Amino acid sequence: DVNPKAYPLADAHLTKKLLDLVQQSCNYKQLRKGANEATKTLNRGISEFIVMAADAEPLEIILHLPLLCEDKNVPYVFVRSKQALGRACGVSRPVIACSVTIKEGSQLKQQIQSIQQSIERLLV
Amino acid sequence: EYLVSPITGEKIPASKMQEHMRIGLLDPRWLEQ
C-alpha cells in the first residue's frame, strides 16, 4: 500500500503479536534497538529474528537488513509504524529496527519459534 | 490510524500519539511552578 518496499510488512493480526513479543523480550533483556544494533547482532549471529518499520524516511537505511538476514539465515518482517515499534521497545523515540537475541535457558523460546514460523509463512 | 490511550482510555489519531503522551501527563505542579 503506502510503501511497496515493505515486502515483509505484517498484517494487523500479526503485528500485535510481534509488538507484544518485542515488549516481552525487552522485559527479559533480550531486545536490541536501532538499525546499527540489529546489524551488530546479525554479524555476531545472536539474533533469531529482526523486525523493522516500513515508514523510514529514506527506507534504504534499513534495507541492508533483509540482505544481511538472508546472509545470516535469520527471519525478518516489516511493520507499518515506527512509533509503535519504538513504544514496544520501551523507548519514547521511534525505532525503525529491532533485534531479538538468543539467550540460554530463556522462557520466550516457544513464542520465538511461533513468531519465526509466522514470519517465514509471510515470506513468499 | 487510531490508537487506544494508555493514559486516558480514549481513541486518538496515530499522528498525535507522541504529543498525546508528552502532554497528557504534564505534571500540574509544573504549571504551578
Binding site: 494487523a12 509503535a84 520501551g90 523507548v91 | 503522551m21
Partner: peptide
C-alpha cells in the same frame, strides 16, 4: 492496536496518581 507506555512513562503516571490521591 494498543500501545505500550515506557518504563519512565509508567513511573510518571504512577507518581502522578499517588500524588493526586
Amino acid at each position: 492496536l494498543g500501545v505500550y507506555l515506557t518504563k519512565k512513562e509508567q513511573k510518571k503516571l504512577r507518581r502522578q496518581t499517588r500524588r493526586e490521591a
